[PDB]
Design an enzyme around this catalytic site. Structure first.
Site, PDB file in Angstrom:
ATOM      1  N   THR A  19       0.814  -1.212   0.000  1.00 22.82           N
ATOM      2  CA  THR A  19       0.000   0.000   0.000  1.00 22.82           C
ATOM      3  C   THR A  19       0.856   1.275   0.000  1.00 22.82           C
ATOM      4  O   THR A  19       1.358   1.701   1.041  1.00 22.82           O
ATOM      5  CB  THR A  19      -1.018  -0.008   1.178  1.00 22.82           C
ATOM      6  N   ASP A 130      10.475   8.495 -12.058  1.00 25.59           N
ATOM      7  CA  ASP A 130      10.189   8.001 -10.708  1.00 25.59           C
ATOM      8  C   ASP A 130      10.910   6.667 -10.438  1.00 25.59           C
ATOM      9  O   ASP A 130      10.334   5.734  -9.883  1.00 25.59           O
ATOM     10  CB  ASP A 130       8.666   7.863 -10.509  1.00 25.59           C
TER      11      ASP A 130
END
Ligand SMILES: COC(=O)c1ccc2c(c1)NC(=O)/C2=C(\Nc1ccc(N(C)C(=O)CN2CCN(C)CC2)cc1)c1ccccc1
Ligand SMILES: [Cl-]
Length: 315
Positions: A19, A130
């Site tokens: 998560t 990223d």
């Protein structure tokens, strides 16, 4: 609850296996194939909405041996579900923690896969923007797969001085890979600080610690990748065949796709038309719509069975 009704038709959901801030990912089993898949779940209402159109359309245009494969996209009133390739080896970051750091030889093995994936991403006109060990996963074969394409169009520790200064997306990924290389070989970031502006400052100065265990050729490559000036920085081209990268290999990084979608696969098409008792020609057409729906999912997960030397069979 009613948002998961459409998904539960096609998948048995297991636990939340991770998560991040933007999405939750659950392990699941594709009912028709028994194949494990990771399902990224995003709440539309509590979200950054452009970030997922970016990622989905990027993944539709990226098919590569070291990019995480997308299978199925389901949108509901409140959710977006992205069914993805499950990578049981988990984050590269965690492997870098369990081992203190990687040896030069083991680093090179790992790094050539990252250069392969990013070089391909650039070939298709994108820039990941990223790149870090958290965003690289080991698949069942212990091969790397690149993930989280939410910032790639046509982390600050990994961000390039130009990108933070907001001035050149291809050269910034080279910088990020420089940081990644450093982390693999050292076990810590070259630029790090608890204060975000002090970290900013370190990044702009470009000065970092050079540990004793690094070879002179590693140090040269790091110095070439972590030029603050992106003009002075080594381009992607000369990274592919750099003497350090070539060591123990003696050929450049094979960045091209080894799994490009040439035509279809007849073995997958037959098993679908056989399992659903459908006209074969009709089944060829609906797959060719490439809607990233349950049928696309089933076809692509059957290619996965073939890719792993297993029989193409549904139950
Ligand atoms: C564009 O692509 C994506 O956006 C994308 C993003 C993430 C994943 C992905 C695609 N595909 C995956 O597989 C992903 C993860 N996979 C995973 C694998 C292994 C683990 N680990 C180490 C476990 O230990 C879990 N393990 C527990 C024990 N049970 C029995 C089996 C499962 C944890 C997460 C994962 C998701 C959340 C954050 C980090 C990674
Ligand atoms: Cl290679």
């Amino acid at each position: 609850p009613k948002d998961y009704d459409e998904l539960l038709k096609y998948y048995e959901l297991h636990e939340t296996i991770g998560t991040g801030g933007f999405a939750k990912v659950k392990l699941a089993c594709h009912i028709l194939t028994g194949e494990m898949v990771a399902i990224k779940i995003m709440d539309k209402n509590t979200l950054d909405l452009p970030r997922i159109k970016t990622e989905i359309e990027a993944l539709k245009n990226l098919r590569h041996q070291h990019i995480c494969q997308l299978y199925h996209v389901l949108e509901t009133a409140n959710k977006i579900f992205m069914v993805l390739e499950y990578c049981p080896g988990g984050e590269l970051f965690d492997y870098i923690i369990s081992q203190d750091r990687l040896s030069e030889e083991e680093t090179r093995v790992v790094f050539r896969q990252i250069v392969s994936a990013v070089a391909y991403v650039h070939s298709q006109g994108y820039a990941h923007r990223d790149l870090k060990p958290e965003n690289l996963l080991f698949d069942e074969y212990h091969k790397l797969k690149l993930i989280d394409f939410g910032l790639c169009a046509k982390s600050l520790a990994y961000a390039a001085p130009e990108l933070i200064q907001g001035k050149l997306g291809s050269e910034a990924d080279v910088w990020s890979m420089g940081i990644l290389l450093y982390v693999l070989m050292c076990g810590f970031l070259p630029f790090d600080d608890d204060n975000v502006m002090a970290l900013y400052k370190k990044i702009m100065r470009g000065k970092y610690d050079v540990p004793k265990w690094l070879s002179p050729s590693s140090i040269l490559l790091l110095q070439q990748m972590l030029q603050v000036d992106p003009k002075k920085r080594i381009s992607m081209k000369n990274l592919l065949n750099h003497p350090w990268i070539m060591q123990d290999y003696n050929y450049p990084v094979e960045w091209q796709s080894k799994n490009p979608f040439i035509h279809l696969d007849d073995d997958c098409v037959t098993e679908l038309s056989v399992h659903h008792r459908n006209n074969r020609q009709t089944m060829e057409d609906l797959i060719s719509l490439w809607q990233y729906d349950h049928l696309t999912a089933t076809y692509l997960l059957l290619l996965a069975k073939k890719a792993r030397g297993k029989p193409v069979r549904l139950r």
